[PDB]
Design a protein around this ligand. Structure first.
Ligand SMILES: [Mg+2]
Ligand SMILES: [Mg+2]
Ligand SMILES: [Mg+2]
Ligand SMILES: [Mg+2]
Ligand SMILES: [Mg+2]
Ligand SMILES: [Mg+2]
Ligand SMILES: [Mg+2]
Ligand SMILES: [Mg+2]
Ligand SMILES: [Mg+2]
Ligand SMILES: [Mg+2]
Ligand SMILES: [Mg+2]
Ligand SMILES: [Mg+2]
Ligand SMILES: [Mg+2]
Ligand SMILES: [Mg+2]
Length: 290
């Protein structure tokens, strides 16, 4: 029933993914995008400095899937990371690791294009991972790499998934990840940001993530989160800490879009409620002491 040898080719792999998808309540595509992200994360985890410390830490929506699992988290198109070295070192090293492969998987990485963010001197970079399995093309994953800010690469947590084990690829998955205080600081800053005149802030989906993150924090001291929020808000030097959590006019339907699939969780069902929940979280963080 569980597979004793790895899949011999892509068809047998897709076929096993679909049997696992139905076997436990997921759409085939969500599970496939998740396997592709696990594979990309394993390529990123082979990038070590001369002490063995990771060079890339996963963040954003990919981190949250790993933390909570597929059923209890938002679908994440992006695979975002924070590097502790320059991209040119990062991009060459991924192509290397992508060529060596991992348990049948191989990857090709398009060229990094700088993107524009006005609060960071070092600009973020986006490119794409074209995955293959035993030679045959498998999936395409957007990647976002950005620079360290304050101490957000100082520590990491190491998350695992057993998705690939279900389809008979037994090797352990262990992905270094940005810690929650810094995920909270970054999403808080992005969700309360006011942008330049061409564009508007569409990030109502971050109000879901911030409610998930507050649960994962549980009853821990918030002093590390407060320190991290102070640090991100000062370094970027856009709007000040503590921010006001403003709802924009198109956000009701975007927010409702970000809740798809999460009926079982205890989350605010409307955007106004979500904003309030996030504002009380902000007030909690700001009051933290010793
Ligand atoms: Mg085939
Ligand atoms: Mg299926
Ligand atoms: Mg199966
Ligand atoms: Mg460097
Ligand atoms: Mg590219
Ligand atoms: Mg710091
Ligand atoms: Mg650590
Ligand atoms: Mg963010
Ligand atoms: Mg505290
Ligand atoms: Mg602290
Ligand atoms: Mg105001
Ligand atoms: Mg909905
Ligand atoms: Mg609704
Ligand atoms: Mg609170």
């Amino acid at each position: 029933k569980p597979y004793s040898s790895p899949p011999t080719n892509l068809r047998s792999l897709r076929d096993r993914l679909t049997q696992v998808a139905e076997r436990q309540g997921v759409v085939f595509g969500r599970l496939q995008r998740h396997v592709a992200m696990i594979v990309v994360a394993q390529f990123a985890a082979t990038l070590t400095d001369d002490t063995g410390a990771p060079l890339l830490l996963v963040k954003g929506g990919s981190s949250l899937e790993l933390r909570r699992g597929i059923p209890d988290s938002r679908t994440s198109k992006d695979f975002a990371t924070v590097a502790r070295r320059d991209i040119e070192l990062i991009h060459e090293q991924l192509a290397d690791a992508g060529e060596t492969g991992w348990e049948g998987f191989t990857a090709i990485f398009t060229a990094p294009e700088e993107i524009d963010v006005p609060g960071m001197p070092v600009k973020p970079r986006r490119f794409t991972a074209k995955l293959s399995y035993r030679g045959r093309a498998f999936a395409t994953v957007p990647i976002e790499v950005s620079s360290v800010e304050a101490g957000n690469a100082d520590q990491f947590d190491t998350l695992t998934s057993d998705a690939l084990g279900l389809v008979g690829v037994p090797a352990a998955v262990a992905v270094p990840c940005m810690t929650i205080p810094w995920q909270i600081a970054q999403k808080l800053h992005a969700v309360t940001a006011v942008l330049e005149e061409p564009k508007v802030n569409d990030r109502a989906h971050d109000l879901v993530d911030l409610q998930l993150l507050e649960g994962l924090l549980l009853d821990a001291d918030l002093m590390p989160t407060r320190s991290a929020c102070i640090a991100i808000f000062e370094a970027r030097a856009q709007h000040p800490w503590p921010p006001r959590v403003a709802t924009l006019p198109h956000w009701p339907l975007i927010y409702a879009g970000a809740l798809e699939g999460l009926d079982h969780l205890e989350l605010a069902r409307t955007v106004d409620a979500a904003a309030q929940a996030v504002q009380r979280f902000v007030a909690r963080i700001d009051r933290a002491t010793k």
